[PDB]
Design a binder for this molecule. Structure first.
Ligand SMILES: C[C@H](CCC(=O)NCCC[N+](C)(C)CCCS(=O)(=O)[O-])[C@H]1CC[C@H]2[C@@H]3[C@H](O)C[C@@H]4C[C@H](O)CC[C@]4(C)[C@H]3C[C@H](O)[C@]12C
Ligand SMILES: Nc1ncnc2c1ncn2[C@@H]1O[C@H](COP(=O)(O)OP(=O)(O)CP(=O)(O)O)[C@@H](O)[C@H]1O
Ligand SMILES: Nc1ncnc2c1ncn2[C@@H]1O[C@H](COP(=O)(O)OP(=O)(O)CP(=O)(O)O)[C@@H](O)[C@H]1O
Ligand SMILES: CSC[C@H]1O[C@H](O)[C@H](O)[C@@H]1O
Ligand SMILES: CSC[C@H]1O[C@H](O)[C@H](O)[C@@H]1O
Ligand SMILES: [Mg+2]
Ligand SMILES: [Mg+2]
Lengths: 380, 378
């Protein structure tokens, strides 16, 4: 007999009980319940099947919970201070029991509120360098890594990213969602064949480049923050993909916040972009020196060319994220809450244009500061 | 445990239990290596092959990859692979079409056979097999499952070490004449070539593009004047599209190095033709049968073919070097006489392989590859 039962606030306290109080459901979306239990505190997250499930949704099994639990556990073996601790998980119940982080704030929300989070990029850069290194062929015996590829195959969730990030914003597809005022600019994109060919190439990398175990959806809404703490949450999109992907998505979301700000307010976000590349690069390099298994690791120029490839892919993926968050199905609050309406349109236009240029020019940039300086000029 | 090692009577008992004959037959073990049995079974008033893996240490799971890979290949190019009548994982057995009327390509090629259709046939094999198991042809969710199904860790381990790693360092698996050492050490001390061998290996390790054959040499092919059959896909897994292309082209070049003068021309025609045909076939499949919205944007197919080509050339360079000084050699080079000419031709294998790896992205056409090779081997 099937063990899956949808939890309530009472059921959740019963479960925490049987794994040796007050409870409130505090979830943000409609695809998961998140139960906060207080005595010492705890979070119990449970996936909600299609099916139902209140309100329109993308149809998904509850297998995503197995990916998220196991992804979070793997991340905590390398960066235990940058992810919530997991106390229990169960794939049939689709349950992850984890550390309570409600004394922190979702990074996106704080950034929109004008919080600057001075260590956000230091922490995310460390998260990125260590997670992305330690699950690759550089760090792992290839036989071990090939099994981890099987274990983290993520078809349904990859299908979402393949469509939404890499495909739908580039044609007149039904999932797109944009203001009519934006159409002339959106059609410029659709008729641009050379950027579309490059989008195809970045997609093919996404589809085929099993380089490391990625988070797969590292935006500012998937991170908890305060002045001194950062915690990366919700790796439900985890699978073996290109190292540059998580880096690009994060960097794109820093730039998306910068577009929603004005003038000298933007400067903290530009420092965060510069710092997250800088830190990602030292962290990845330190891990490579100290912990690489291949005979080729210490040949002068090999780490350098590896970093150049990651950088190029990361900028291309960033451009995809910039564009897709502006005109695709899933938007960001940074842009959608800009006031007045005409200013919102103008900044949405600039997201499309800087995304396009990121994609096109990815392999011409030599440093992160090149990326920032191109951005600033395009958004003057 | 079910597995039992077959003998000649045991094999005939198997064939009859599958109803593939009928009832009087004869059987002889005819296997080349010592890691598999191959039983030929014949009927007066029809014939059959039963291949069985026997437990460099390797599990018998390779037999499940071989069967499955052979079956997948026959869905697209049934005329270019042996038919499979039965397979079983526990017994590690593939029952297949008898191809004893044909000759192993490498052996014919060394004897001086020219096989005029070999490259046309391999080109079609390569274009179709490599297209039709990729994301271009398959729903991504379907492809992701096939990646699991063909994960092949042990055999990929052999390739990772032998083609991509050991020839480039003073490693214990290497095996070469002492007279060749100065040239071998030129390679070990060459950083920029090794950095590039590293990149090609990283592609091998990470680039899950299609279901490849993974060991497409001239000894994995049966030939005659009119027929070609690709055998033994035991190394099959999801890897870079250019790999099987490089390994085959390198193996044509290796035979060229074992021939002299005008006798080399057939192999050069084969190299040009295998690329041409691989490219025409892959393109026709892409036009007719690609699933992505991006397939018909002008320049995309072209850029895709340019990347395949570049990788294929780099993988060819690796194969040339690896077969000359690593553990597993080729008879083309090892049987060249006199000893001194053999060493000189093995030197040219190392140097043409090195150039292929380093220049892979500078060549514009297959003709540039052939012309560079001809020049270096003058
Ligand atoms: C003008 C500012 C300097 C900022 C500053 O000085 N502060 C900079 C520094 C990075 C530069 C870009 C990249 O190089 C890539 C690319 C190379 C081509 O060649 C020309 C176009 C393009 C997009 C460049 C343009 C311009 O050159 C940039 C934006
Ligand atoms: N460990 C934790 N501690 C405290 N609150 C948490 C928490 N995990 C989740 N939450 C609360 O629940 C909200 C939703 O969390 P989460 O992003 O994991 O859910 P979700 O996966 O259903 C959303 P989506 O569909 O956007 O991916 C958070 O923004 C937060 O307020
Ligand atoms: N389908 C077939 N029809 C006729 N003979 C066949 C055959 N398959 C294999 N053989 C015979 O068996 C020999 C060895 O076969 P094969 O190359 O498949 O085995 P193998 O995998 O044991 C070799 P290796 O271990 O070197 O890769 C061939 O060279 C051929 O003479
Ligand atoms: C159907 S899910 C839409 C988006 O939400 C997730 O966070 C991913 O970013 C996905 O693209
Ligand atoms: C240890 S096996 C050596 C070689 O034989 C196979 O045919 C492959 O080419 C492998 O590299
Ligand atoms: Mg979620
Ligand atoms: Mg074999």
């Amino acid at each position: 007999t099937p063990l899956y039962e949808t939890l309530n606030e009472s059921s959740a306290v019963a479960l925490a009980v049987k794994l040796g109080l007050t409870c409130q459901e505090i979830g943000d979306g409609n695809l998961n319940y998140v139960f906060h239990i207080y005595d010492r505190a705890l979070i119990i997250k449970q996936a909600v099947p299609y099916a139902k499930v209140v309100g329109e949704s993308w149809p998904l099994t509850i297998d995503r919970a197995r990916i998220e639990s196991s992804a979070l556990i793997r991340q905590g073996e390398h960066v235990p201070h940058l992810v919530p601790r997991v106390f229990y998980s169960d794939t049939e119940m689709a349950v992850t029991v984890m550390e309570d982080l409600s004394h922190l704030k979702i990074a996106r929300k704080g950034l929109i509120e004008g919080e600057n989070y001075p260590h956000l990029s230091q922490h995310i850069g460390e998260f990125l360098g260590k997670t992305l290194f330690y699950s690759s062929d550089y760090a792992l015996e290839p036989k071990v890594k090939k099994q981890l590829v099987k274990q983290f195959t993520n078809p349904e969730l990859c299908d979402i990213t393949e469509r939404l990030v890499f495909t739908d914003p580039f044609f007149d597809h039904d999932t797109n969602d944009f203001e009519e005022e934006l159409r002339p600019f959106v059609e410029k994109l659709w008729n641009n064949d050379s950027v579309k060919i490059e989008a195809a190439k970045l997609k093919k990398s996404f589809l085929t480049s099993a380089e490391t175990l990625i988070h797969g959806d590292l935006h500012t809404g998937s991170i908890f923050a305060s002045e001194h703490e950062t915690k990366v949450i919700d790796p439900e999109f985890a699978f073996y993909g290109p190292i540059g992907f998580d880096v690009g998505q994060f960097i794109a979301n820093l730039f998306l916040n910068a577009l929603s700000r004005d003038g000298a307010d933007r400067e903290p976000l530009y420092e965060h972009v510069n710092q997250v590349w800088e830190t990602f690069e030292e962290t990845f390099s330190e891990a490579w020196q100290k912990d690489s298994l291949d005979v080729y690791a210490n040949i002068d120029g090999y780490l350098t060319d590896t970093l150049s490839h990651i950088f190029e892919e990361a900028i291309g993926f960033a451009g995809c994220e910039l564009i897709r968050r502006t005109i695709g199905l899933a938007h960001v609050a940074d842009l959608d809450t800009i006031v007045p309406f005409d200013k919102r349109i103008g900044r949405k236009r600039l997201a499309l244009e800087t995304g396009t240029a990121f994609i096109e020019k990815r392999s011409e940039f030599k440093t992160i500061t090149d990326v920032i300086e191109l951005f600033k000029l395009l958004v003057k």
